[PDB]
Design a protein around this nucleic acid. Structure first.
Lengths: 94, 97, 109, 79, 80, 98, 109, 94
DNA sequence: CTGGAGAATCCCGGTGCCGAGGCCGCTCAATTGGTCGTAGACAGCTCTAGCACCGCTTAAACGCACGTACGCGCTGTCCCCCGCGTTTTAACCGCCAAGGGGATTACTCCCTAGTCTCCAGGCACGTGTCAGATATATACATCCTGT
DNA sequence: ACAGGATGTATATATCTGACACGTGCCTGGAGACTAGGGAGTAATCCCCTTGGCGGTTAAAACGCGGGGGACAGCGCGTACGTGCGTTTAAGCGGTGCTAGAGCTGTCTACGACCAATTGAGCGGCCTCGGCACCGGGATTCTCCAG
């Protein structure tokens, strides 16, 4: 009766802000769980090396800006930094 | 009697199987292959049903990706017929052999 | 008698969780310590990339006149967009199939 | 043995149709089932050495998925 | 700086092709090899500069190049 | 009498010549002007170490020599000996670069 | 007045250091804690692989009648052995060159 | 005047046990330093995931036997496990 | 095909120059010897789900045949690339010299780990209905012989 | 090019099933407030290394002229693979039952982090001489034109 975590609550909230009259399968939700887990460990895996290369011990948001610019291609990295700095700016104001 | 000229059933099958998502290898003769490729590493291994279907989604994604690469080797040599020159070239360029 | 507990995902206006991502960074063996803005930055990047796919996968579902996204529509969304295809070029999607392209030499004329 | 023959001539031929193949020479059906078994001998021997490390006797679905990811062939839909 | 891709001259692409065992070379191979190499340098320098300004220094070091090649899957030995 | 080797024979002796050596085949000064020309598209007034340009040097010939090996087998497969720019486009698409 | 300090590389009969490898595991962000036999196992695997290359690179140097191993001999050692070529198939060795092979179609007859 | 570490002491000891009348360049020692650093982070990087997959927190020698069997090919992995268990057996006896 | 000519690589041997190897301080990171708490081992138990079986249906593989379009070889023509000599260009070398910025050592402060407590967000579990799969019959579009 | 027939394929309606979407109740992971220790930001200094410049040498690049080998279009001949029909062949289903092993819980014990005082291994600098790089020279191999 163990409790196992996923992102299926949060994917279904983002879907209703983009297509509010569209659903998803169970097999397509298990792929969107595999997507979020994969992109998490790419960015956290690259930010772990950026902190290690510069002999730091803290992963800040600045090691995640650089890991986004390394991993995400082209214009897809340009909107993801805009979406990232805006969330940090709103977080420190509240 | 009626007769399609050779090359017209082959194109509607390319149109057919690029529209579907099914597994094209039969289920049971693929389970019997997995259970004997795995019997020379350990005897009496067991498999989950989602562990064999994970192997079949990967082997069919590998071969369909190989036949796209092997088709560009036959078009490059001014053919349309695949022949194992073309497979052995695409295996070498991707660093597999 | 302190205050009502506000989630850190609502301080930044996000839907992906900040508190869960902060735990997974700190228990995932990435560094000795984790900054406070680091899960806020990462949960916004993860939310943008899922919003980018579900927008394209939702379009492919209405073009096939369906209201549920099946893994075919996720395959068609990723392999048609040029930036998601390069982010996910080594990734197999189960029950996704391929994209229909016949080489033009094979078409009869 | 005799289980590699279960991947039949029409099963290889319709995998070739999804890849876009128009016509197949007859010496391909003994070529690709040799290419297939080299692929499975690399994925399974990493899958079953995850089961030995976890002291299991069954091959779970995650052991195939972790074995595929380290060959650069990551799979979405099984965990 | 401008018009530096033709510093990779016609006999220099030919000497690179003959270390790869090429016997005869078409004349249109040269304009693509200027473009194939320029795409490759625009991906390693794009990552190597990204490692420099993360560390806030104006000098692209040799370790930044070795790191930028390693994340493209082309590990290089001999520089650290 | 003016003496000339047949077309092909000094091509083979300088396939043997450069497969035996380790020297860098691109001249060093025009390559260093190229690196600094490309790098201005990302930051102005950058500086380079000497060994950072020589690391980009070593990486680019290894990419090209490895590519001219793959594009040669695409030309021999098409039953010819001359590499043409359709052969580079085949080798760069099977590997997954284009 | 305790005892003379013995290195952990001499308890196992190794040349690669066990104490340095133990620090690099524990400060390299790999796990919460590191077993005591883990750097002993890893420093022996690293010592075998360098002994395997320097045996083959030392053979290629005496076949070229030299007594110093230059990076050409490391390239010839790795690309001729079939197991080191697959371990190091995505690795460029600087100043290593290639191996001499002409395709047999190109040779004249 | 900072002190930077390498493996150049230890590579030169292994060379004199294999070819006792053979030397090495400086550029070939900098490649053997790049080799040892690379194979270290492959094995320690794979053993870090084996401990994480089984929800352990300790990297033991048993997570390094499995990472050797995953990474090293064929017979080259078979002699490296023999060289590894023998060093652990000699270590626990002394 | 069968030999002299001529070009190129090769083996030798001698002279200089510097990079490897071996040395010597000395600093600091590995070692030794205890101690403390918790990770992982081992035992017991639950109950999921993996393996094995039989039977009936029928979809799919198999085998055979026929003929057509493709692979492959042969041939011929043009023009493109290779080899080589002459002239032009700039890479290469060594040296001179300023100064930008990397690489330290201090110093402080503020950010993050750690802790206890409170509590709501998210997981497991039910539960009903609507998306959709399947059937059945159309019109429609498309291939193909004969024209 | 062109028209009719025939065989697949899209369109539309009808029906059932089961999987998604939702609600509910509980638990544990997240948030609140707080405290204290060290990471990193900031400032100052030092000197390595990077940029810039200049002139002499000569190698390598650019240009150009023959001309010959190879790309490539065209042709014809004969296998060999595609289409289709009839006949075996086991895959797929579904239903039933057994139980091996995954998973969980709850012990406790040995193992590893932590600390501190100590010392020797490894690192940086400092020299020396031998490997080796290169220049000169004669000899072997090898390509190619005429015989």
């Amino acid at each position: 009766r163990s409790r196992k975590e996923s992102y299926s609550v949060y994917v279904y909230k983002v879907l209703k802000q983009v297509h509010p009259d569209t659903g998803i399968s169970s097999k397509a939700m298990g792929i969107m769980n595999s997507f979020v887990n994969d992109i998490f460990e790419r960015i956290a895996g690259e930010a772990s090396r950026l902190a290690h290369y510069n002999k730091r011990s803290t992963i800040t948001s600045r090691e995640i800006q650089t890991a986004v610019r390394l991993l995400l291609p082209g214009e897809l990295a340009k909107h993801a930094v805009s979406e990232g700095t805006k969330a940090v700016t709103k977080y420190t104001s509240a | 009697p009626h007769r399609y000229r050779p090359g017209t059933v082959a194109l509607r099958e390319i149109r057919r199987y690029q529209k579907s998502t099914e597994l094209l290898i039969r289920k049971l003769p693929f389970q019997r292959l997995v259970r004997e490729i795995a019997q020379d590493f350990k005897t009496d291994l067991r498999f989950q049903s989602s562990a064999v279907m994970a192997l079949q989604e990967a082997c069919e994604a590998y071969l369909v990706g190989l036949f796209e690469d092997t088709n560009l080797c036959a078009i490059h040599a001014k053919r349309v017929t695949i022949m194992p020159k073309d497979i052995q070239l695409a295996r070498r360029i991707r660093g597999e052999r | 008698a302190r205050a009502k507990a506000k989630t850190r995902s609502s301080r930044a206006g996000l839907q992906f969780p900040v508190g869960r991502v902060h735990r997974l960074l700190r228990k995932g063996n990435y560094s000795e310590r984790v900054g406070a803005g680091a899960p806020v930055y990462l949960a916004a990047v993860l939310e943008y990339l899922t919003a980018e796919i579900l927008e394209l996968a939702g379009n492919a579902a209405r073009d096939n006149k369906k209201t549920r996204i099946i893994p075919r529509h996720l395959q068609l969304a990723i392999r048609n967009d040029e930036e998601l295809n390069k982010l996910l070029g080594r990734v197999t999607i189960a029950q996704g199939g391929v994209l229909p392209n016949i080489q033009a030499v094979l078409l009869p004329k | 043995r005799d289980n590699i023959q279960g991947i039949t001539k029409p099963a290889i031929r319709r995998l070739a149709r999804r890849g876009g193949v128009k016509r197949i020479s007859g010496l391909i059906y003994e070529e690709t089932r040799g290419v297939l078994k080299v692929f499975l001998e690399n994925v399974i021997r990493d899958a079953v050495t995850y089961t030995e490390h976890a002291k299991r006797k069954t091959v779970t679905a995650m052991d195939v998925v972790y074995a595929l990811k380290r060959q650069g062939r990551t799979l979405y839909g099984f965990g």
